[PDB]
Write a protein that binds this DNA or RNA. Sequence first.
RNA 1: UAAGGUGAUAUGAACCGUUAUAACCGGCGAUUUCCGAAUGGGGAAACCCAGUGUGUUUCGACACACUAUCAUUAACUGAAUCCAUAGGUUAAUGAGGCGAACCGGGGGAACUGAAACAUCUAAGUACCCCGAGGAAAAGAAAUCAACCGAGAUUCCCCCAGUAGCGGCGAGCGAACGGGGAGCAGCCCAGAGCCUGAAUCAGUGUGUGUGUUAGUGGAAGCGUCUGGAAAGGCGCGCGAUACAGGGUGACAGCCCCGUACACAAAAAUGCACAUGCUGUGAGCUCGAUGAGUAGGGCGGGACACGUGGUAUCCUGUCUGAAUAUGGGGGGACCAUCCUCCAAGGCUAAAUACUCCUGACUGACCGAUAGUGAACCAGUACCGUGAGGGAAAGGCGAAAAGAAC
RNA 2: AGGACCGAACCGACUAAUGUUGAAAAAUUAGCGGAUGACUUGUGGCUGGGGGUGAAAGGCCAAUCAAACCGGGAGAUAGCU
RNA 3: CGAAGGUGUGCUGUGAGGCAUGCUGGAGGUAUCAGAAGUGCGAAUGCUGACAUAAGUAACGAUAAAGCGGGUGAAAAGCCCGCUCGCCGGAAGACCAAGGGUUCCUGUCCAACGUUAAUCGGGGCAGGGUGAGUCGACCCCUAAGGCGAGGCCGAAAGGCGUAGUCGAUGGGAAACAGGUUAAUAUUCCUGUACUUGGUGUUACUGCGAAGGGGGGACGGAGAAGGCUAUGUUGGCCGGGCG
RNA 4: UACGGUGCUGAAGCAACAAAUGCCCUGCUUCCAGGAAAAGCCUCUAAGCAUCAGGUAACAUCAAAUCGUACCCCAAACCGA
Lengths: 62, 102, 46, 93, 77
Amino acid sequence: KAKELREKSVEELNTELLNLLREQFNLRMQAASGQLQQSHLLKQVRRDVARVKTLLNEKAGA
Amino acid sequence: AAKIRRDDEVIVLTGKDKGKRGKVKNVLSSGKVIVEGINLVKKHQKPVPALNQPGGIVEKEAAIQVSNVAIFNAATGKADRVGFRFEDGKKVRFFKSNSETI
Amino acid sequence: MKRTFQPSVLKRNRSHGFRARMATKNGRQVLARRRAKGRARLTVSK
Amino acid sequence: MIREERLLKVLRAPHVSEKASTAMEKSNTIVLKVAKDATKAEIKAAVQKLFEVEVEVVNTLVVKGKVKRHGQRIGRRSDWKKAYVTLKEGQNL
Amino acid sequence: SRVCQVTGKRPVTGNNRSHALNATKRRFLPNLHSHRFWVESEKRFVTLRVSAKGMRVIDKKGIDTVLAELRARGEKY
RNA sequence: UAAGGUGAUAUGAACCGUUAUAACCGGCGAUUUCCGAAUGGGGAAACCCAGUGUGUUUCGACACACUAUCAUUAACUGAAUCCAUAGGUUAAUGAGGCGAACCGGGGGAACUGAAACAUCUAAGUACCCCGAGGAAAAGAAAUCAACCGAGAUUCCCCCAGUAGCGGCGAGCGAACGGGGAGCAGCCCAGAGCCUGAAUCAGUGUGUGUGUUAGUGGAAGCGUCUGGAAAGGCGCGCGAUACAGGGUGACAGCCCCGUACACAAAAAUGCACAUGCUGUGAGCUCGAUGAGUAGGGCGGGACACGUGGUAUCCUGUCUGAAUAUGGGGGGACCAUCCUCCAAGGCUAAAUACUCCUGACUGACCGAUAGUGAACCAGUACCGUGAGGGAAAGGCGAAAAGAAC
RNA sequence: AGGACCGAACCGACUAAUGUUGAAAAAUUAGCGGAUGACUUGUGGCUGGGGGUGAAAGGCCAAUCAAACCGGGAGAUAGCU
RNA sequence: CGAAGGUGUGCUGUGAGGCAUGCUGGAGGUAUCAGAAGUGCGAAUGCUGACAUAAGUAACGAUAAAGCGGGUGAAAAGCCCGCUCGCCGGAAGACCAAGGGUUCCUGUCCAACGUUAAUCGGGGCAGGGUGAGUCGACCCCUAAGGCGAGGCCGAAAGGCGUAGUCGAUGGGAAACAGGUUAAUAUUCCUGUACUUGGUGUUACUGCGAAGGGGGGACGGAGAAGGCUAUGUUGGCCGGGCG
RNA sequence: UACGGUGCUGAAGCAACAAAUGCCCUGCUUCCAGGAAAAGCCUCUAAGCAUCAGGUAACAUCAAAUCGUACCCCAAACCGA
Ligand SMILES: [Mg+2]
Ligand SMILES: [Mg+2]
Ligand SMILES: [Mg+2]
Ligand SMILES: [Mg+2]
Ligand SMILES: [Mg+2]
Ligand SMILES: [Mg+2]
Ligand SMILES: [Mg+2]
Ligand SMILES: [Mg+2]
Ligand SMILES: [Mg+2]
Ligand SMILES: [Mg+2]
Ligand SMILES: [Mg+2]
Ligand SMILES: [Mg+2]
Ligand SMILES: [Mg+2]
Ligand SMILES: [Mg+2]
Ligand SMILES: [Mg+2]
Ligand SMILES: [Mg+2]
Ligand SMILES: [Mg+2]
Ligand SMILES: [Mg+2]
Ligand SMILES: [Mg+2]
Ligand SMILES: [Mg+2]
Ligand SMILES: [Mg+2]
Ligand SMILES: [Mg+2]
Ligand SMILES: [Mg+2]
Ligand SMILES: [Mg+2]
Ligand SMILES: [Mg+2]
Ligand SMILES: [Mg+2]
Ligand SMILES: [Mg+2]
Ligand SMILES: [Mg+2]
Ligand SMILES: [Mg+2]
Ligand SMILES: [Mg+2]
Ligand SMILES: [Mg+2]
Ligand SMILES: [Mg+2]
Ligand SMILES: [Mg+2]
Ligand SMILES: [Mg+2]
Ligand SMILES: [Mg+2]
Ligand SMILES: [Mg+2]
Ligand SMILES: [Mg+2]
Ligand SMILES: [Mg+2]
Ligand SMILES: [Mg+2]
Ligand SMILES: [Mg+2]
Ligand SMILES: [Mg+2]
Ligand SMILES: [Mg+2]
Ligand SMILES: [Mg+2]
Ligand SMILES: [Mg+2]
Ligand SMILES: [Mg+2]
Ligand SMILES: [Mg+2]
Ligand SMILES: [Mg+2]
Ligand SMILES: [Mg+2]
Ligand SMILES: [Mg+2]
Ligand SMILES: [Mg+2]
Ligand SMILES: [Mg+2]
Ligand SMILES: [Mg+2]
Ligand SMILES: [Mg+2]
Ligand SMILES: [Mg+2]
């Protein structure tokens, strides 16, 4: 997913992080609560977070 | 660079089903392939109370070594061996006999 | 009868612990010896 | 506590024991599995931010993980932190 | 340590030999003395732990030349 | 590179992907908790507690950064004490600890052997300690030789168990000289004319070379036995490939491979070319390492135990000559020869293998071989240092025995 | 008042029996001594091997002591079995 | 179309051994002549593993002691419930530190573990369970002692030690009843409280230390007196009329 | 009331005596062997800051983190195989 995220900016990436992080939290809630058939979304969302932070460190100025 | 693919028609070279022709179903990590209706084992499937519960003797396909099968040519009507060559800009498999691309 | 081992974790930690060994040159070598022999439990700690 | 990124990592899961259902019914107290490095202030701000419910007080304890056997192998489960979160009055979820 | 700052004379080891030539390990220590040396180049007394030979070496070379060899060797004096 | 994939025990679940952002492999990158040299202070290792400075805030509190010691240099400052100096604060640079062997150095045993034992031996061994490097040390004659000459150091084979040393016991044990491996010579102790002309050092670039992923890679059927064929029989084919490993029993031709041929976006090594920056040759004339050589005393080292004992080192006390001069040639003298100490640098031939890759073995094949073929430095023992096991094999395929 | 008296806790260990592959690698049972002192006890700390400590028995220094334990020299040496 | 190995049989050689062969075994073995050795075991109080023997013997761990009924269960001397009995009671009760580390509670299982049986268990498996401003640690403070910038000493290692810094077994702020869970509670709930800080507002104001002083701050024995904890009786209330 | 217990109400709830090794007592008395330290705490000022900061009191408001807390603990859970 990194190719399109590169077009986005630091803001518009920090917010995408929080939204991803919230989605992470709700999935974590749904998972423990017996719900969430689709167990695969946890790795799916965990890796998008990793993807947005790698780009932020790539846009800090380095 | 694999010679036997997932949905290729093969013929068995060594075994109870020497001479039989099947279609490959799975290419396992082990260098073994499952071929439709070939290495039929008659299992003794235990019952489970939860999911797919009926205990039963199932006749499923077992896995044979990829070494023990060959792609069927279907033009010659015989087994054959695979080679790899580059056509227009892509790696393609060809029948050793007749040099035709699969 | 009173036996020889009378556990104290502080006495154990001070007499043979990791900091006690890294304190002296010869304790640094005890660990170097245990590190080379591949001991799972380098010292009495924990 | 204040950073939103930190609050979204602090609450792990709700605990679904009988003592916790009692705590909900009687004492207005939800029992949560939280991060081992979660402090009482972080859990309060997290619940108040995430579940949108008022929090009176947070009690906490660290559960020691259990030694188990898997055939011959010993193994230990990871310590986890339990949080009793007393609400003012109002539960939704 | 029993070392001269001028010469670098340190204790050296050896043997005590008896008439029967029984050998026993022993040390030869220098003739070390703390002596205040007048540095007229600086109008100051400088105190050095020195061998009697280093004392002879200072007389010959001059403490001024000597100390220049010491601060060219570390050897805080 | 790819049609298959989400490491293992280990199935299952929920999914990704199939002509190119699935996975896998390689390169450069990113993240990289806490402890540990551990370095902000402490501490019973993986924990406790700060300080400063910024930037944030709903004013509850947040996030990040810096803050060790020592050495060096610098700046500011700064006593007794006028100057100053010690001392103080800060900055910058560097070190710190780990690691198998090899190396060099500082210290240094005893058992033992002598058929007892002390000299002697074991042995400068084991052990402790310091330091370094890819090797280290050593090194360009104050050396040998013998009146002929050699031409720095190191390693190998001889010389030779010789000459000698030796309670002349036990034992220790050379060199000269020869054959070889590999050779490389330089600089300071100062001036001037000539001036950046040799030389490696870094530090850029070009072109080749290799490494770190990988691509292609020959040719076989029929029949017999059999659970199964690769085996038997028969008739064929390839071979710069019959190395090997696999496959339902023994396969050149089923598979992976092998010979052979090719290949790199990116990074990098060793070689070359070339460019910036710094180091200086070449000439000419000068200069030629002093508490040193040597000596006395005590010790050590030289094969050499003080012996008739040269030579080297020096703890102590002394102490020259200085090219018209000195050192050595195994007491010592003379003569003759030979070299020129007291200041330094220096490749290769040599040593070793924690680790990596390939290959091999009249090496082992589960009481063997590593202690450990297996989740082993584990379990277990022990306060601790430390000690330290046992334990491999269904089957071709789980077809692992429905009922 | 008391290194005073009798006597429990507490500290010790004179006798006897039991047990001696024990319940226990030193105990049990009955009795016995001290029991405000040179007492006793907890926690922590210091002393290290020809060294310690010893109201002194060569006693004790992790069930090990006329020189601890572990590792190494080390396959010591063994005219003996 | 059955290798090694194993197990019998037959034949044979002066002997070590050899040949054949059945059965098992299910994949390797190897003539000949040479070559090399971890080359031949009954002993070494040999080493390791395995298995005997004594022997179904001793013993089943305090001579505090059991008995019955019912229950559950495949099965009950041992578990549950119950009724009696007996034992401890300055303990064999209760709460802790230390040390241990889930042994706690519930459900489930009985192979091994339990010196017997086991339905039971500190046993196996699974789940649950520990809640703090006031308890305690951390924290402030220091003792012995330890480390120890510089420093002094020392062949090296390193030793001693100043400033400092650690170091409790000591000093230092504050919470009580009652109620509650299968298992936590001075931690949860009820009621009633206390302490220390920070920040603000108000009124007033001499406040400020690494320093000075006080305090903290301390022995043994002994004695009387006053109190409480606690108990005994009486009264009161409730039940009782054996 | 699922036999394991639950929800409402609720009597009297007094006195006297006795009495600690506990409290007053970190006291008193006496003795010789003559009995920690440091901080918190209170207080005084120095440099120094003053119609500021800081101090006392009242009042409000906020905070008081973190770790331990199960269970055995004269014992079948520690030391003793
Ligand atoms: Mg100790
Ligand atoms: Mg730190
Ligand atoms: Mg530190
Ligand atoms: Mg000797
Ligand atoms: Mg002898
Ligand atoms: Mg000798
Ligand atoms: Mg030689
Ligand atoms: Mg290929
Ligand atoms: Mg091929
Ligand atoms: Mg095959
Ligand atoms: Mg001499
Ligand atoms: Mg000489
Ligand atoms: Mg000549
Ligand atoms: Mg000279
Ligand atoms: Mg082995
Ligand atoms: Mg075997
Ligand atoms: Mg071993
Ligand atoms: Mg072994
Ligand atoms: Mg008395
Ligand atoms: Mg008496
Ligand atoms: Mg007692
Ligand atoms: Mg008794
Ligand atoms: Mg008795
Ligand atoms: Mg008495
Ligand atoms: Mg005696
Ligand atoms: Mg003992
Ligand atoms: Mg050693
Ligand atoms: Mg021996
Ligand atoms: Mg030896
Ligand atoms: Mg064989
Ligand atoms: Mg056979
Ligand atoms: Mg035998
Ligand atoms: Mg014999
Ligand atoms: Mg009998
Ligand atoms: Mg009998
Ligand atoms: Mg009997
Ligand atoms: Mg019994
Ligand atoms: Mg009954
Ligand atoms: Mg358990
Ligand atoms: Mg229980
Ligand atoms: Mg049993
Ligand atoms: Mg049974
Ligand atoms: Mg249990
Ligand atoms: Mg010290
Ligand atoms: Mg120092
Ligand atoms: Mg402190
Ligand atoms: Mg309880
Ligand atoms: Mg105020
Ligand atoms: Mg009373
Ligand atoms: Mg009656
Ligand atoms: Mg009392
Ligand atoms: Mg508790
Ligand atoms: Mg408790
Ligand atoms: Mg008890």
